Ligand binder design. Structure first.
Ligand SMILES: *[C@@H]1O[C@H](CO)[C@@H](O[C@@H]2O[C@H](CO)[C@@H](O[C@@H]3O[C@H](CO)[C@@H](O)[C@H](O[C@H]4O[C@H](CO)[C@@H](O)[C@H](O)[C@@H]4O)[C@@H]3O[C@@H]3OC[C@@H](O)[C@H](O)[C@H]3O)[C@H](O)[C@H]2NC(C)=O)[C@H](O[C@@H]2O[C@@H](C)[C@@H](O)[C@@H](O)[C@@H]2O)[C@H]1NC(C)=O
Ligand SMILES: *[C@@H]1O[C@H](CO)[C@@H](O[C@@H]2O[C@H](CO)[C@@H](O[C@@H]3O[C@H](CO)[C@@H](O)[C@H](O[C@H]4O[C@H](CO)[C@@H](O)[C@H](O)[C@@H]4O)[C@@H]3O[C@@H]3OC[C@@H](O)[C@H](O)[C@H]3O)[C@H](O)[C@H]2NC(C)=O)[C@H](O[C@@H]2O[C@@H](C)[C@@H](O)[C@@H](O)[C@@H]2O)[C@H]1NC(C)=O
Ligand SMILES: *[C@@H]1O[C@H](CO)[C@@H](O[C@@H]2O[C@H](CO)[C@@H](O[C@@H]3O[C@H](CO)[C@@H](O)[C@H](O)[C@@H]3O[C@@H]3OC[C@@H](O)[C@H](O)[C@H]3O)[C@H](O)[C@H]2NC(C)=O)[C@H](O[C@@H]2O[C@@H](C)[C@@H](O)[C@@H](O)[C@@H]2O)[C@H]1NC(C)=O
Ligand SMILES: *[C@@H]1O[C@H](CO)[C@@H](O[C@@H]2O[C@H](CO)[C@@H](O[C@@H]3O[C@H](CO)[C@@H](O)[C@H](O)[C@@H]3O[C@@H]3OC[C@@H](O)[C@H](O)[C@H]3O)[C@H](O)[C@H]2NC(C)=O)[C@H](O[C@@H]2O[C@@H](C)[C@@H](O)[C@@H](O)[C@@H]2O)[C@H]1NC(C)=O
Ligand SMILES: *[C@@H]1O[C@H](CO)[C@@H](O[C@@H]2O[C@H](CO)[C@@H](O)[C@H](O)[C@H]2NC(C)=O)[C@H](O)[C@H]1NC(C)=O
Ligand SMILES: *[C@@H]1O[C@H](CO)[C@@H](O[C@@H]2O[C@H](CO)[C@@H](O)[C@H](O)[C@H]2NC(C)=O)[C@H](O)[C@H]1NC(C)=O
Ligand code: NAG
Ligand code: NAG
Ligand code: NAG
Ligand code: NAG
Ligand code: NAG
Ligand code: NAG
Ligand code: NAG
Ligand code: NAG
Ligand code: NAG
Ligand code: NAG
Ligand code: NAG
Ligand code: NAG
Ligand code: G2F
Ligand code: G2F
Ligand code: ZN
Lengths: 499, 499
């Protein structure tokens, strides 16, 4: 019987009690990163994260930081491999920058052979240290040219351009890469990029944010979500029909959260909780497992929800070998109105739920996850048992999928100094508490989870936050980015992996 | 009789001897700037200078600086108007960022109304202080989307996109703007952008620079030059047929240089000097005055020189109301081989000339213009009489055009400290020595020159050099860019204007 803690103080930092041997022998342990966040713009074309962060610098982060140079993994990719080698990691999730290998977006316009060689060298270096690559084709960094030609994922033209890009990656790297991710966190771009305009490309309704250059927060999230599923399923079909000889697997990435009722004896809050599961996970998991959106979405969203043709439904249904599940936290849900006729209506209001970290009796769900200095009532809190609840739900609701945990981690403030930054005990507590529950859910519920990749390998540019928060297991000095030095967390993870 | 000095020391800094009253009463005096160099990326889409400086940071300048924030004329445009008001300037040359008003390049994709309002406010502010705007439509900052769709000026698709962009500018601002420039320095993009790859977009032959993403240095300069002339002439036709009611004038910008023989008794060097005039000025001035390229270019460049159809020849011939002439320096010319079959052949070798600042007897042409710290034998030297020689040549060879001097100025090192930077006596000597010759040529040769705009209003990002050189008449502190403080040069120019 496995007992895991839910509240501070935790004791899972002790490698005598929890380590890699607690898990099956073939289980993969590593870390993750993304191209915009770590490489720098040297050697690549421009993408919508470059566009968004330069056009709307106060949305890039409070320091106006961006990915122009960041930790310079373009130059220091060998140092990333060295961190992984130090950890004795068996996996590394990284993304390919579309704009580094096809700067002009559409593959018929030509490829950047030097950009292809950059990834060849990385992949070869990983494999030579025994590290299995998990490669994300699209981690939000769409070539700027495609957004300007047709508004990227807002248009169905994106399916064929994404397909041709994916084909080039499979042709070039698939002899060595056996685990591919298509689109990072399907829920994110639609909602933050086209609903709230917190993320690139920064579209939304005029009264939601007057700085959006265009958009409609009520309709566009649904259009983008739909084209994301079609483009993902087209690439999966391509992979499975034309690259089956490479012996690899492919899947989407979901951002996952667990949801609990704000008031667990109030039927209205209980209903809002179940609505949240459908609108946040089922929006994509319904199409991925059944080829249709959830009935509550069909009913509520009405004419604003696109339909799949029979051919598209068949293409999208079952379009995964595995699921990359990212997990960070859990929210309480209570009812909220859905004012569809308001000019500031957003797709996110369709779920009819208001999300908090404090329930109706004043209980905070768990330890502090992220402090919000502008508004402290907006602090985010974590909940280690949520990873257990998510995994169990995916096995039970979504046909017992093979799962890899593709992201899991916590930030510490960028205002801390080096020493404080290195002594990141809050990060050991977060990582170990979630690893305990993950082991518990694998053993108790038999969820087919086969790996775990913590967010992040090193400090990087954080979407929306600049360099004001740090997520790395390895520290990077922004005045001289060459080195990546294991933090207390990285050292702890090293001993968890090789106890 | 006017006597002007050619060698240090100069005495034209004395406003008793040379001032604005030395020139006709209607003569316009001011300063100039360009959008990429001063505004910052806030509020606009991305262009090829953003692309080039981020993809090839060591080509952006030795400090890797770029135009991301620069002096923040987006925020501080009122402070630029204040500098002009302090100078009692009567003209200001600025450029419109295509990417600020049409971020998606093609006008049918929509316009950025807030970007239009930015220029409305500037123009209105200038006119209210009695300053005549001279507005450059294209100062090299092509929306990145157009370079990625069809390689910008390499393709004839650029003509109609440039035309639609120009139309929008005339419609929006032409009721107030009466002097328009089409393309800044026609010789520059073809040669530096597509021949040497020193400038965006950074194309060239593989053995010229292995870092070019594509190109051909022998052919591409000619293609781009040709499309530049066609796009320029299309816009001029549009202006003169559809916006004649606005009562304004339009013209191209040429970079001008004078050329002297390396050895003035050697017929080979004399021939190389005359070749240089044709290949550097006649490349564009031949088409602009006659609808054909110079015969020496037709003969030497052969199949690599495009031909104008009769319709295109007619469109391009006479396509100017005035000429914007930029002038900085003069070179000696001697013969050099033209190895057309070499893989590193460039369009610039077609002239069969090698350019220096020192003649065959060891005479340096004039005072120091720019020091080159990597290689001192590469220092550039200036020649005040060259402005006289250029103006006289344009009147005599090119049908007595109306001319405005659209750029003239000198850099000082970015390594100097504030105090040294402010005491920019070398800049007063450069500006006054050229103004003396300009007055002399207007009086002696009756050249129809009606204004002079010194390069630059303030310190900015310098193409190819970052923030390592300063060209401003007003100082900007890079640790806090709000203020623009008149240097010794700006104060001298203030007294030259209002003695
Ligand atoms: C897994 O995919 C199955 C489809 O392959 C889902 O079953 C389908 O569910 C739909 C309803 O969503 C059933 O379609 C209904 O068919 C009747 C009967 O002929 C309809 O009137 C109803 O159409 C009306 O309601 C719609 C909203 O649902 C409106 O959009 C429409 O304008 C009408 O108001 C709907 O008919 C559809 O109408 C729109 C068409 O373009 C569409 O093709 C048409 O089918 C459908 O019969 C059913 N298919 C079968 C083979 O059973 C399945 O849905 C789950 O199971 C069914 C039994 C219902 O209980 C659903 O509520 C529940 O979601 C889904 N499973 C999951 C878990 O999502
Ligand atoms: C101002 O524009 C005038 C054109 O409106 C120029 O005059 C034209 O000059 C061209 C030569 O460049 C003369 O064309 C020649 O016509 C003969 C006679 O029929 C040709 O064989 C010669 O073609 C051959 O030489 C070419 C290189 O010049 C090659 O490309 C071609 O393959 C042949 O090798 C050329 O004929 C032209 O060939 C290419 C065709 O597609 C083209 O249309 C055809 O014309 C032309 O007759 C002449 N036009 C008239 C009305 O005079 C004028 O050129 C200047 O003046 C003329 C007299 C010559 O001295 C030129 O050397 C000199 O540049 C130009 N002025 C300026 C100052 O540039
Ligand atoms: C968890 O949700 C439950 C279920 O909603 C909350 O209990 C309900 O709380 C209501 C108070 O907000 C109770 O209703 C009231 O009852 C008093 C006593 O008779 C009456 O005077 C009030 O007018 C009110 O009655 C309602 O008026 C509106 C009508 O539309 C409606 O029909 C009436 O319900 C209600 O009885 C109670 N439900 C039951 C199942 O207990 C619970 O609220 C917390 O506990 C309740 C007992 C009460 O002490 C609340 O003060 C306290 O907030 C809520 N828990 C939390 C922690 O918010
Ligand atoms: C400015 O250009 C002029 C014209 O080219 C230079 O003068 C020429 O310089 C040549 C030396 O480079 C002279 O030719 C030589 O004459 C000596 C004396 O007879 C002879 O022994 C040499 O072999 C050579 O002769 C040539 O050999 C190559 C053959 O293909 C050719 O037919 C011969 O010309 C040449 O006489 C002279 N031209 C005349 C018009 O004076 C001038 O050079 C400078 O002045 C000349 C006088 C000489 O003192 C050079 O040392 C000195 O560089 C050059 N000016 C500069 C400053 O470079
Ligand atoms: C978002 O787009 C939707 C659909 O185009 C707009 O909602 C429609 O608004 C038109 C104009 O009132 C109405 O006649 C229809 O009833 C609406 N259709 C549906 C599907 O709701 C909505 O106004 C647009 N929002 C923004 C802010 O532009
Ligand atoms: C530049 O483009 C030109 C023309 O396409 C190339 O020169 C041609 O080269 C082909 C292959 O040798 C020759 O057969 C022709 O004689 C050339 N044409 C002319 C007009 O010169 C040149 O090789 C290309 N340069 C680069 C470096 O790719
Ligand atoms: C690993 O953790 C397990 C508890 O599940 C423990 O039994 C084992 O001894 C630990 N391994 C080491 C080497 O500490
Ligand atoms: C696969 O590749 C072949 C040949 O390149 C092509 O004919 C076929 O349509 C492709 N695709 C898919 C996704 O099946
Ligand atoms: C618009 O929405 C904001 C936040 O969603 C809300 O605070 C405000 O009350 C809404 N206004 C209207 C007119 O509904
Ligand atoms: C690496 O991990 C393998 C597998 O668990 C282990 O046998 C080996 O000793 C570890 N190496 C280090 C240096 O920890
Ligand atoms: C301006 O310069 C001219 C010389 O051309 C001189 O005669 C005149 O007095 C000067 N003006 C003033 C006010 O110094
Ligand atoms: C001018 O505008 C009119 C109407 O918009 C158009 O029909 C005509 O073709 C345009 N152009 C030029 C360059 O003449
Ligand atoms: C190539 O050109 C460079 C500079 O233009 C020159 O130094 C070199 O000698 C040339 N090589 C060949 C093979 O011509
Ligand atoms: C501005 O220039 C005009 C025209 O020469 C002049 O009359 C006026 O006094 C000048 N103002 C200042 C403050 O120098
Ligand atoms: C930040 O910038 C946008 C324009 O990019 C502007 O709408 C907004 O006022 C600014 N936000 C704040 C909070 O200052
Ligand atoms: C920066 O860090 C690297 C690795 O720690 C070091 O070797 C290099 O000398 C440092 N550069 C400077 C300028 O300090
Ligand atoms: C600078 O960068 C380019 C790649 O952008 C590379 O080809 C070249 O080696 C570098 N230049 C120097 C002088 O280091
Ligand atoms: C920077 O300069 C402006 C103008 O000189 C000044 O008013 C502002 O206070 C300064 N900001 C800082 C942080 O020094
Ligand atoms: O916010 C923490 C991380 O969450 C996950 C996103 F995929 C990654 O790009 C982001 O940095
Ligand atoms: O190099 C000095 C100046 O020369 C002129 C170019 F148009 C301008 O953009 C540049 O900064
Ligand atoms: Zn930047």
């Amino acid at each position: 019987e496995i007992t895991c803690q839910e509240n501070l103080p935790f004791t899972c930092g002790n490698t005598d009690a929890l380590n890699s041997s607690s898990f099956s022998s073939d289980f993969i342990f590593g870390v993750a990163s993304s191209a915009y966040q770590i490489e720098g713009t040297i050697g690549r074309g421009l993408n919508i994260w470059d566009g968004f962060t330069h056009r709307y610098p106060n949305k890039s982060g409070p320091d106006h930081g961006n990915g122009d140079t960041t930790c310079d993994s373009f130059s220091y990719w060998q140092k990333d491999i060295d961190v992984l080698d130090e950890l004795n990691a068996t996996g590394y999730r990284f993304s390919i920058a579309w704009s580094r290998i096809i700067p002009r977006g559409k593959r018929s316009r030509g490829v950047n052979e030097k950009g292809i060689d950059y990834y060849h060298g990385l992949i070869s270096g990983l494999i030579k240290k025994g590290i299995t690559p998990f490669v994300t084709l699209f981690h939000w960094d769409l070539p700027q040219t495609l957004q300007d030609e047709y508004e990227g994922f807002l248009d169905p033209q994106i399916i064929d351009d994404f397909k041709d890009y994916a084909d080039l990656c499979f042709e070039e790297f698939g002899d060595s890469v056996k685990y591919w991710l298509t689109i990072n966190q399907l829920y994110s771009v639609p909602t933050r990029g086209y609903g709230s305009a917190l993320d690139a490309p920064g579209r939304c309704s005029p009264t939601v944010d007057p700085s959006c250059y265009a958009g409609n927060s009520s309709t566009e999230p649904y259009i983008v979500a739909h084209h994301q599923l079609l483009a993902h399923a087209k690439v999966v079909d391509l992979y499975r029909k034309n690259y089956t000889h490479q012996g690899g697997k492919i899947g989407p990435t979901m951002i996952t959260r667990w949801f609990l009722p704000y008031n667990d004896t109030d039927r209205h809050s209980i209903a809002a909780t179940e609505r949240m599961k459908e609108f946040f996970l089922g929006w994509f998991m319904g199409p991925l497992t059944n080829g249709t959106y959830p009935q509550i979405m069909i009913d509520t969203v009405g004419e604003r929800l696109p339909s799949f043709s029979p051919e598209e439904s068949n293409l999208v249904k079952g379009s995964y070998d595995f699921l990359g599940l990212n997990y960070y936290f859990t929210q309480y849900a209570q009812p909220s109105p859905n004012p569809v006729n308001s000019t500031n209506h957003t797709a996110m209001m369709d779920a009819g739920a208001k999300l908090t970290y404090i329930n109706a009796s004043g209980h905070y769900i768990g330890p502090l996850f992220e402090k919000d200095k502008a508004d402290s009532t907006d602090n985010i809190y974590y909940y280690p048992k949520g990873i257990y609840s998510v995994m169990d739900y995916f096995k039970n609701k979504y046909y017992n999928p093979l799962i890899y945990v593709t992201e899991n981690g916590i930030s510490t403030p960028g205002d801390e100094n080096r020493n404080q930054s290195m002594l990141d005990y809050t990060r050991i507590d977060y990582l170990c508490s979630h690893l305990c529950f993950l082991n518990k859910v694998i053993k108790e519920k038999d969820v087919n989870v086969k790996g775990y990749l913590a967010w992040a390998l090193g400090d990087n540019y954080e979407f929306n936050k600049g360099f004001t928060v740090r997520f790395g297991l390895s520290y990077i000095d922004w005045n001289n980015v060459t080195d990546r030095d294991l933090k207390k967390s990285g050292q702890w993870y090293q001993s968890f992996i090789s106890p």
